[PDB]
Amino acid sequence: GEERGRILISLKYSSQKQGLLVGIVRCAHLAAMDANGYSDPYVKTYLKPDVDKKSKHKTAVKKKTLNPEFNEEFCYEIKHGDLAKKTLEVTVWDYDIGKSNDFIGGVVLGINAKGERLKHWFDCLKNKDKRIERWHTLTNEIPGAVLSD
Ligand SMILES: [Ca+2]
Ligand SMILES: [Ca+2]
């Protein structure tokens, strides 16, 4: 997979809420998918398998930037023992008018991942009520997204 920028993600499993808090903090040096040399980025998240197709979250769109700051956090209600059953799919897109939005890149976290994609997830799961915030380099190859380039 080729690099498409970096994303800073925060994860915290809250015992009180019985929920995974997912923070989309900011991105750095995203791929430019517009004719002006920039992108209009937003980030989507899913928690999969998504029983009932309700896990979609999307950040606001930031205009004309390759270094967006989102500082948004969402929550997935889930018992701690089910966390290891799931993958967190985080994808970055470029909002366009007049055509479908361009895919920028993504990252998938889960116990079946590798390297820091695995370690970030594992660190969250093994440290309840501790926020773990880590950068990941985006890939251009996300299953179910677009063809690799
Ligand atoms: Ca575009
Ligand atoms: Ca655009």
From Swiss-Prot:
It comes from the Eukaryota. The modification Phosphoserine is found at residue 148. Disulfide bonds: none annotated. Residues 3-136 form the C2 domain. Changing residue 56 to E: Loss of calcium-independent binding to liposomes. Loss of interaction with the SNARE complex and altered fusion-promoting activity. Ca(2+) 3 binds at residues 34, 94, 96, 102. Residues 2-112 are annotated as: Mediates interaction with STXBP3. Ca(2+) 2 binds at residues 34, 40, 94, 96. It is found in: Cytoplasm; Cytoplasmic granule; Cell membrane. Expressed in brain; highly enriched in neurons. Interacts with STX4; the interaction is calcium-dependent, increased by insulin and glucose, and mediates vesicle fusion with plasma membrane in pancreatic cells and adipocytes. Interacts with STXBP3; the interaction is direct, occurs at the cell membrane and regulates glucose-stimulated insulin secretion. Interacts with cytoplasmic dynein light chain DYNLT1. Interacts with the SNARE (soluble N-ethylmaleimide-sensitive factor attached protein receptor) complex composed of SNAP25, STX1A and VAMP2; the interaction is calcium-dependent and competitive with SYT1. Calcium sensor which positively regulates SNARE-dependent fusion of vesicles with membranes. Binds phospholipids in a calcium-dependent manner and may act at the priming stage of fusion by modifying membrane curvature to stimulate fusion. Involved in calcium-triggered exocytosis in chromaffin cells and calcium-dependent spontaneous release of neurotransmitter in absence of action potentials in neuronal cells. Involved both in glucose-stimulated insulin secretion in pancreatic cells and insulin-dependent GLUT4 transport to the plasma membrane in adipocytes. C2 domain 1 is involved in binding calcium and phospholipids. C2 domain 2 may also play a role in the calcium-dependent targeting to membranes. This is Double C2-like domain-containing protein beta. It comes from Rattus norvegicus (Rat). The gene is Doc2b. The chain holds residues 265 to 412 of 412 of the full protein.
